[PDB]
């Protein structure tokens, strides 16, 4: 038994300074052998994520030993969730839901069970795509970063600033920062529509549009008491403006390249820490973390924004849309709504 599947392959590269378009991806049939080795499972793909880090995988050299480049005419891959259809792995049964970071962009797959994590849909009230975002790594990154590195003190009247506030994890800080005890949460953003979405929908107390040129003064209006915590998801000039407004005994969390000397001098004089946050060093916090996120969500205390495209044929269109940076939150493609067995 071979089964015919559809796969999305890298058709062409945009060039390092180029803009990805849907035509950089191609759907192609593939004949997949139905056989399972010891430990393998056959999965049906339900949801796939598209994320900004993937941009560099379309380049021949990703400038990073953390990311392997995608290869021409080969299936792409990333965050995914599916259902087990057949298993030769003791930890997985037909009907289990599983995730991977390296889920291939195809309709069905044969995968090593040891690279899959079983997930429990009751945690997300059956909204399975939330396991790729707010009840997955992005939510966990946001929660563990603040919880473990923010030094938040309930009743201390702290202001936290979050750069890259319209991204999948940055967009959850308005809610998570408040739930975790922060009194004020200010987002930094690239458009007016995004600023108003953060603030009307995602519980940010204020938002700064960094493309409209009076950024320092905007930030000052948003942060009348200065900045106590900075979650830096960008770096560069935005971070230099932000650091200039930081209070004594402040904390910068990078989610470290040297600062300009005048900025470094402010950092030192004001006793500001600046530390890399690496979420994979907090694996023992993951399970309690997902339970917390799930609880908030079920309570209605954590609202999530996702954009969901439909169909494996629309991966390229969704990737392109994701690249225009218009949407707020997690970009998802629904490959199947079929969890039958």
**Rounded distance between C-alpha atoms, residue 219 and residue 209, angstroms:** 9
Residue set of the binding site for NADP(+)? 167-170, 194, 210, 233, 255, 277-279, 327
Domain span(s) for CATH 3.90.180.10 in the chain: 1-134+305-341
Cβ neighbours of residue 41 closer than 8 Å, sequence gap 6 or more:
84, 85, 86, 87, 88, 89, 92, 98, 110, 111, 112, 113, 116
Residue set of the binding site? 101-102, 167-170, 194, 210, 233, 255, 277-280, 327
**Rounded distance between C-alpha atoms, residue 111 and residue 114, angstroms:** 9
Q: Which CATH class is domain 135-303?
A: alpha beta
**Rounded distance between C-alpha atoms, residue 105 and residue 231, angstroms:** 32
Scanning the structure block, which residue is given the tokens 């050299």? 61
Strands 306-310 and 330-334 turn out to be parallel
**Rounded distance between C-alpha atoms, residue 249 and residue 235, angstroms:** 20
Cβ neighbours of residue 105 closer than 8 Å, sequence gap 6 or more:
7, 8, 48, 75, 76, 77, 78, 80, 312, 315
Return the CATH number of the domain spanning residue range 1-134+305-341. 3.90.180.10
Beta strands in the chain (DSSP E): 2-10, 25-33, 40-50, 77-87, 97-104, 108-112, 117-119, 159-162, 184-189, 206-209, 227-232, 246-254, 273-276, 306-310, 330-334
Q: Is 33 helix (H, G, I), strand (E, B) or coil?
A: strand
The structure tokens listed for 241 are: 């403006």
Resolution, Å (one decimal): 2.1
Residue set of the binding site for substrate? 101-102, 278-280
> What are the angstrom distances between the C-alpha of 291 and each of 72, 135, 139, 265, 284?
40, 9, 11, 41, 13
Domain span(s) for CATH 3.40.50.720 in the chain: 135-303
Nearest to 32 by CA among 58, 56, 6, 10: 6
């Amino acid at each position: 038994h071979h089964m015919i599947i559809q796969r999305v392959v890298l058709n062409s590269r945009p060039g390092k300074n180029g803009n990805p378009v849907a035509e950089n991806f191609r759907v192609e049939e593939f004949s997949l052998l139905d056989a399972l080795n010891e430990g393998q499972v056959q999965v049906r793909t339900l949801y796939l994520s598209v994320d900004p880090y993937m941009r560099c995988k379309m380049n021949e050299d990703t400038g990073t030993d953390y990311l392997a480049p995608w290869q021409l005419a080969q299936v792409a891959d990333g965050g995914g969730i599916g259902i087990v259809e057949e298993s030769k792995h003791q930890k997985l049964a037909k009907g289990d839901f599983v995730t991977s970071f390296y889920w291939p962009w195809q309709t069905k797959a044969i995968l090593d069970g040891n690279g899959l994590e079983k997930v429990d849909p009751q945690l997300v009230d059956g909204h399975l795509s939330y396991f790729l975002g707010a009840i997955g790594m992005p939510g966990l990154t946001s929660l563990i970063g603040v919880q473990e590195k923010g030094h938040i003190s309930a009743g201390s009247n702290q202001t936290m600033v979050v750069s890259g506030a319209a991204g999948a994890c940055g967009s959850l800080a308005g809610q998570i920062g408040h739930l975790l005890g922060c009194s004020r949460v200010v987002g930094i953003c690239g458009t007016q529509e995004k600023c108003l979405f953060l603030t009307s929908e995602l519980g940010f107390d204020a938002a700064v549009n960094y493309k409209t040129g009076n950024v320092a003064e905007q930030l000052r209006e948003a942060c009348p008491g200065g900045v106590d915590v900075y979650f830096d998801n960008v770096g560069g000039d935005i971070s230099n403006t932000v650091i200039s407004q930081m209070n004594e005994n402040s904390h910068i969390i990078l989610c470290p390249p040297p600062l300009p000397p005048a900025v470094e001098a402010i950092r030192k004089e004001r006793n500001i820490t600046r530390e890399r946050f690496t979420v994979l060093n907090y694996k023992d916090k993951f399970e309690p973390g997902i339970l917390q996120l799930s609880q908030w969500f079920k309570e209605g205390k954590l609202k999530v924004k996702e954009t969901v495209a439909k169909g494996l044929e629309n991966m390229g269109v969704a990737f392109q849309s994701m690249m225009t940076g218009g949407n707020v939150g997690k970009q998802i493609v629904c490959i199947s709504e079929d969890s039958s067995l």
